[PDB]
Structure 1
């Protein structure tokens, strides 16, 4: 086995070689959502509950969200419009079985097309979705839809949540770097088909989710040692970390039950995240001798307007750092795990079109944060690519 381990692994940093995104072709305007939502769920007369919802939507800083669920589909699925008075899991599982792999496929083809290499070269697949209805998981169905080789090594990431956009990058880094020639297809596909439900005055937290969550899928090609003049890297995955904020189990959570996926959200999420964000930064960048957070490009899971404002304030980030992040939240809302990837795409695109010296708005180092159930925080250190 002399030199076997050395030849088996890769040499450089895992690099994002392409980013593709997709969304259901149904843009839903936030300005008119309160009326639509309360009408379609049969709660038009509950003015006070609708006004609380209007309030939440109006302050969400989300102009629109793409949604698989349409008035037609909801009219054919009354049970999904209820809160919890009747079961709806089975019906939702059917929707997921079709929609999650579909968006995943669409986003993956875009990433594959950009990458410009044959899909026969894809060696691994990391597939993530809040939930998956059966066994095999959706990772199997997506691979089949894409016509990937049967020997592609799959890993499904389910029920992790909104922080998984970071999780999949952390996982892809080790796969790409420890396997010479490896090319990992990374996909995050999310849809509110599993969380959408009628409003309830005794569960205002669920109400907030109904105003923030949107649908979408992201796809990446990750690999180390990109081929000169053939493959093109936009970002390098340098270092990662994951940590749980102590004593915050009920801050963000969900439950898969007969009524489908229910979620819980506490108002303290903003404080909890900002109070622990500083340490994530020091632990991540001390080794790089960086202490000025404004010298980095930023990517933050847009869990909610408040979280972003609180993080921006606590760390004294100048107004431009979260522009790409807020831009995505405004145009797509909270697409869970897929969010940070759309933001990375927005970042590199804005950099090229503004004539920046790097894919990271002219800066060398950057940080990407994923937040979710735990409360869990995923930290990803990125390095941009010269333009």
Structure 2
């Protein structure tokens, strides 16, 4: 009865994505205009040297747009946020965060929930991810509250992991769904530049990189194993996952929560470091399925930057069609951190539909999903598309 309590307790098939919800703040920022706006709101028009370094950066970021909670209104009222680090500004950011992060998350759940089609009362687990969370309880408690989730929903907050959390969230979703029969996991990633936006400094060119690539956004997935026939529609199946630390990459990507808010540190080595180890990951994940041709899988890569994508595409020489949904997202949404990959997952199943593809993975049956962040950490996830009738 005890060894019997286990089998009945766990689920059957693979944890599957039964819905995908997305949301962003109202302020769409045109990248072609950001350089003038950025240097004007921070009061740095007098430093023509920097501006050109930033312009070059935005102009080569492959990002044409980004949604930002931070608007000129909020910035003119928060001069401390416009400074580099000469004055503290954590508490003001923290307030923005306690309000915005949960708000974007709910908006994403509400869409995911609706698509899913079942009562929110059926959600058993909640996985919440954000670069940071301002208080105790974390944002996971706040979002559950706002959404109206049952009080016995088991929450897990994933804070301060990094841009790779988009993958770890799926790795966690997978184990939650498959070890608990009849379970439905609500997986949410919510990010804003409110905690990281700050003024430019010539002596901190890396931080200037983050000011041109980071954008706001929230994604919501409903994950569950053993979907109900004719009721729940799965569009992806989470097959296998792995996490690793790239060798000799210590300090490559990092951040610090300090009195001046969150500080971003990024080494020029990241692209190299990811390219030189991305293949190992592939053989470790796909050889077990007897797959050696990378181009036979569909792709979902975290858009950490234009250079990183071009590298991976070369070291693996994936054809030009692989990073299309991924670049589609980066272009229209920028680097929304952990949320990015899920936005691409929706972009992928969308294109598949609008193009008469045999499956949700653009005709291909299997695919990989990548997460890159502080570590440097590499998060791998093997998917299984679903056939579209």
| TM-score, structure 1 normalization | 1.00
Cα RMSD (Å): 0.4
Question: Per-residue deviation at 1:126?
Answer: 0.2
Q: Deviations over 1:321-355 (max 9, x none)?
A: 00000000000000000000000000000001100
Question: Per-residue deviation at 1:171?
Answer: 0.2
Partner of 2:88: 87
Question: Per-residue deviation at 1:3?
Answer: 1.2
Question: Per-residue deviation at 1:176?
Answer: 0.1
Q: Deviations over 1:25-48 (max 9, x none)?
A: 110000011000000000011101
Partner of 1:338: 339
Which secondary structure does the structure 1 equivalent of 2:202 belong to?
A: coil
Question: Per-residue deviation at 1:2?
Answer: 4.1
Which secondary structure does the structure 2 equivalent of 1:154 belong to?
A: strand
Cα distance in 2 between the residues matched to 1:118 and 1:343? 26
Partner of 2:272: 271
Partner of 1:197: 198
Question: Per-residue deviation at 1:249?
Answer: 1.6
Cα distance in 2 between the residues matched to 1:79 and 1:261? 13
Question: Per-residue deviation at 1:5?
Answer: 0.3
Which secondary structure does the structure 1 equivalent of 2:21 belong to?
A: strand
Cα distance in 1 between the residues matched to 2:331 and 2:215? 11
Gaps of 5+ in 2: none
Cα distance in 1 between the residues matched to 2:42 and 2:264? 18
Cα distance in 1 between the residues matched to 2:101 and 2:384? 31
Which secondary structure does the structure 2 equivalent of 1:143 belong to?
A: helix
| TM-score, structure 2 normalization | 0.99
Cα distance in 2 between the residues matched to 1:262 and 1:249? 17
Cα distance in 2 between the residues matched to 1:146 and 1:346? 25
1:1-387 to 2 correspondences below 5 Å: 1-387=2-388
244-253 or 15-24: bigger deviation: 244-253
Question: Per-residue deviation at 1:123?
Answer: 0.3
Q: Deviations over 1:190-209 (max 9, x none)?
A: 00000000000010000000
Q: Deviations over 1:352-385 (max 9, x none)?
A: 1100000000000000000000000000000000
Cα distance in 1 between the residues matched to 2:317 and 2:50? 36
240-249 or 274-283: bigger deviation: 240-249
Q: Deviations over 1:88-130 (max 9, x none)?
A: 0000000000000000000010000000000000000000000
Number of residue-to-residue matches in the alignment? 387
Q: Deviations over 1:158-191 (max 9, x none)?
A: 0001000000000000000000000000000000
Cα distance in 2 between the residues matched to 1:85 and 1:247? 33
Question: Per-residue deviation at 1:134?
Answer: 0.3
Which secondary structure does the structure 2 equivalent of 1:248 belong to?
A: coil
Displaced runs of 4 or more, over 6 A: none
Q: Deviations over 1:284-338 (max 9, x none)?
A: 0000000000000000000000000000000010000000000000000000000
Cα distance in 2 between the residues matched to 1:32 and 1:26? 13
Cα distance in 2 between the residues matched to 1:231 and 1:199? 48
Question: Per-residue deviation at 1:247?
Answer: 2.1
Cα distance in 2 between the residues matched to 1:52 and 1:263? 18
Cα distance in 2 between the residues matched to 1:347 and 1:136? 34
Cα distance in 2 between the residues matched to 1:120 and 1:107? 17
Q: Deviations over 1:222-279 (max 9, x none)?
A: 0000000000000000000000012212110000000000010000100000000000
Which secondary structure does the structure 1 equivalent of 2:189 belong to?
A: strand
Which secondary structure does the structure 2 equivalent of 1:3 belong to?
A: helix
